[PDB]
Amino acid sequence: GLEAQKRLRASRVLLVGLKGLGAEIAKNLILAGVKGLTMLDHEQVTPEDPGAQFLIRTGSVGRNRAEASLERAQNLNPMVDVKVDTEDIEKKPESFFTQFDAVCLTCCSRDVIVKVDQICHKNSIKFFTGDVFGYHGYTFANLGEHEFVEEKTMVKKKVVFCPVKEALEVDWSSEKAKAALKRTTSDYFLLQVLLKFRTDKGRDPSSDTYEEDSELLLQIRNDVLDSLGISPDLLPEDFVRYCFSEMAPVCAVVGGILAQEIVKALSQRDPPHNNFFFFDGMKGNGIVECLGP
Structure with a gap:
C-alpha cells in the first residue's frame, strides 16, 4: 500500500x-x-x-x-x-x-x-x-x-x-472449552510448560544440562496439566527432546x-x-x- x-x-x-x-x-x-x-x-x-x-x-x-x-x-x-x-x-x-x-x-x-x-x-x-x-x-x-x-x-x-494474561489462562472447565480442547495444537500447553521452566529457573532449558532440563520439564508437564485439569498425555511424553537449544x-x-x-x-x-x-x-x-x- x-x-x-x-x-x-x-x-x-x-x-x-x-x-x-x-x-x-x-x-x-x-x-x-x-x-x-x-x-x-x-x-x-x-x-x-x-x-x-x-x-x-x-x-x-x-x-x-x-x-x-x-x-x-x-x-x-x-x-x-x-x-x-x-x-x-x-x-x-x-x-x-x-x-x-x-x-x-x-x-x-x-x-x-x-x-x-x-x-x-x-x-x-x-x-x-x-x-x-x-x-x-x-x-x-x-x-x-x-x-x-x-x-x-x-x-x-x-x-x-x-x-496476554487472558490468553495464557484458559478455563478448560467450561463445556465449550472441552470441545475446543480437542482441536488445540498442544504446543500451547508446551508453551505453558516452557514458560514456567523459565520462571522457575531464570533460564531456558539448556543442552549442557539437558540432563536436568528433561527432568524439570517432566514435573512442569504434570504440574501445569493437572493444575489446568488436563490429561498429562495431551502433549508428547518425550517433548523434552525437541524443545532444546536454538x-x-x-x-x-x-x-x-x-x-x-x-x-x-x-x-x-x-x-x-x-x-x-x-x-x-x-x-x-x-x-x-x-x-x-
Whole structure:
C-alpha cells in the first residue's frame, strides 16, 4: 500500500531479547525500513548464541548481546535508526515504552510479558511476544482493537484482541472449552510448560544440562496439566527432546512470521493472526490459535 508505507517508515519498534529469534526479527524489520528499531538486551553473549545468530561476530562470548549485534544490524539498512539498550527491561519506567509504536518481546519471563502487555494496552502500543525452543516456536499478538484495510475494493475491517494474561489462562472447565480442547495444537500447553521452566529457573532449558532440563520439564508437564485439569498425555511424553537449544532455521521461520505480523500491524493491512501462531519444525506445521476470549 502507499500510505501504508508512510506509516511503516515512520514507525519505531522496541525489540527485547537478541538471541536467535530476536535478530531474525531485527533483520526483517530493518530491511523493511522502519524509522527506528531499539534492540534491548541486558545479557552477555553465551558460547551457544552464535549457533543461530548471525548478527554477532564469532568470539564475542562475554560481550553484551545487544551491543555485539549493533554493527551488523545497522549495516543492513543505513536509513534505519538502529539503537541498542543494555538496561534490563524490568528497570524501564512506563514512559520508556510510549516512544515506540510496537513492542516485541523474546526471552522474557511470563510476569514480564503480562506487565509489558498491560503497559502497551493502556498506551495503545501494539504488543507482540515470541520465542523458540528447539524445533518449536510461537508468536503472540495483542493489537487491542485493530482496524485495517483489505481487498476483495477496499474493506475497512476491525479485529478485537485480548490481553496476554487472558490468553495464557484458559478455563478448560467450561463445556465449550472441552470441545475446543480437542482441536488445540498442544504446543500451547508446551508453551505453558516452557514458560514456567523459565520462571522457575531464570533460564531456558539448556543442552549442557539437558540432563536436568528433561527432568524439570517432566514435573512442569504434570504440574501445569493437572493444575489446568488436563490429561498429562495431551502433549508428547518425550517433548523434552525437541524443545532444546536454538536452531537457525526455526528462528528464521518464526522470526519471518512475527516480523510480517509486526509489519501488518504497523502498516494496517491484511488480517493479523489472532492471536497465537505455533510452529513445529518436526512436522512442518504452522497453526493459528485464538485463545483467551
